[PDB]
Amino acid sequence: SGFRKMAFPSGKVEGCMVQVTCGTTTLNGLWLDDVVYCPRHVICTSEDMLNPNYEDLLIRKSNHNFLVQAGNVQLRVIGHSMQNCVLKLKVDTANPKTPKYKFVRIQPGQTFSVLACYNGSPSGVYQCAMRPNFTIKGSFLNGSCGSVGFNIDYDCVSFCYMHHMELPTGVHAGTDLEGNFYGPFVDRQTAQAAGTDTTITVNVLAWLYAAVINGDRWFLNRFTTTLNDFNLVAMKYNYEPLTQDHVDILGPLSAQTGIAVLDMCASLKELLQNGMNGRTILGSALLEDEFTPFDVVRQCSGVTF
């Protein structure tokens, strides 16, 4: 029993973290076989970030300008290229600790584990959801750029996030491993603000099922509703609309508890309309939306890797 925000074991990714230095700028890189991936703005000075001409800045750089360090070992860069906002440094040495991996682009509402690193050394691991506004609410300090987010899909590390920046909001923005930003953000010092966010409704429902599995039932009522009626309420409280694909994804949790999804929707509607009655659910006094349906199944079923 019990339910916590749980990250994937980080060992496989820890073995891939290196430090990348260009001039005065240091950050983290991901070392996979004989390529190191890192944010391309490592090549930029503070003055370059005002209006960086990345294609030109990279042309002026050579391999010797890139100091890659895997712990105490210096990796020799023998090639450098740019894929969108990610720099790819080919090195003399292939990482013997490279896990079976894939690069995937996640959708808003999906979660991943973040391995926060500094100077190529991992510092901590925690779970993040990709917010609907394409930011994440992370915990990052100076030098955390190049930290990566990932999932472990059965027998494969799926990298989905590389950290690039902190917005004035204090929330965080980055790219997939192909170097394409999540959301409308750019690696330049220009005006950037996260759009209006929303609550991930299917995740809230998944979390209520988790509570039921763990014995919490006070919020269950004898009512049911329609998908349309539920979505009229959800809109009023800045919740994302619930689709039939969302209902389908909740099927395993509805099966496990015997509570139909639209019954749970009726319970959530009442919680939205009248509050949580000064009670807590799985240690929270608010409705939590950073657990996916699969996160719930994984935790309550003991999936291993």
Next chain:
Amino acid sequence: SGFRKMAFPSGKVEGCMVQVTCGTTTLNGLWLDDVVYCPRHVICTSEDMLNPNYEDLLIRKSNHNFLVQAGNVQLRVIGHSMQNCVLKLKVDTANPKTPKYKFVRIQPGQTFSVLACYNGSPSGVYQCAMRPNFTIKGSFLNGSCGSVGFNIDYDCVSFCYMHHMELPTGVHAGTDLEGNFYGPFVDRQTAQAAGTDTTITVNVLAWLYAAVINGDRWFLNRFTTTLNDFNLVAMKYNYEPLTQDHVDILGPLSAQTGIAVLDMCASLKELLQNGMNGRTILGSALLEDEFTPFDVVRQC
């Protein structure tokens, strides 16, 4: 910026996790040098747990009765002994992935990371606090026994917890790595109640400092309180007493925010009496008490 419940990277512990089987009972063990540590009740049947005599149950066992698997490599057991509620299986090969480590016994209110494992393989990592009543509010399923809790310093892993059981209330109890249970619990299927739990006051204050650092200030007031006057209020809400040792521990955060500890105590006093006014702090509508002062420093 930002503030999150963060676990230590689990790699160094992952490389120590193995599977221990005795008869039909399997669980996790911790392989350090040439010794595998695991809960001693791995030697019990479901029925033995009603009234076990571990000393006698262990005489019935041979080295061959213990199947230890590092993944799918069998580790030859060449010795077995019991230390309090932990079994120590001597194996014929030292773990090449043994980190620098120590066994430590932690106090209520201290935090640690848990690497939840099943059949010797890691499933997830999260952060826990040892509660004042010596339970932990974990996430553990059947087969999770032998999962360990730890802190990482330098690159030294300080192991502080090994999981043994879930109480009927859904909370969790275990031992240090010398086999001594935290709290008044025993590895026998008998009535054992956890004491009434209380809130870890020093951690709540540390977290309020974290919120100030991240911009939340609505709860700050200019009220003033004595340490004793504060403790009189906190005791009414089942908060742990705050001592001068706690005040000193919060010094580094009070220095950074320029907010005196007792002034932060005056904010906490008002939050306990009135409530939070339908507002939130660092994304929570409850007072969070599972961040130590050092967790707040390390993270910021």
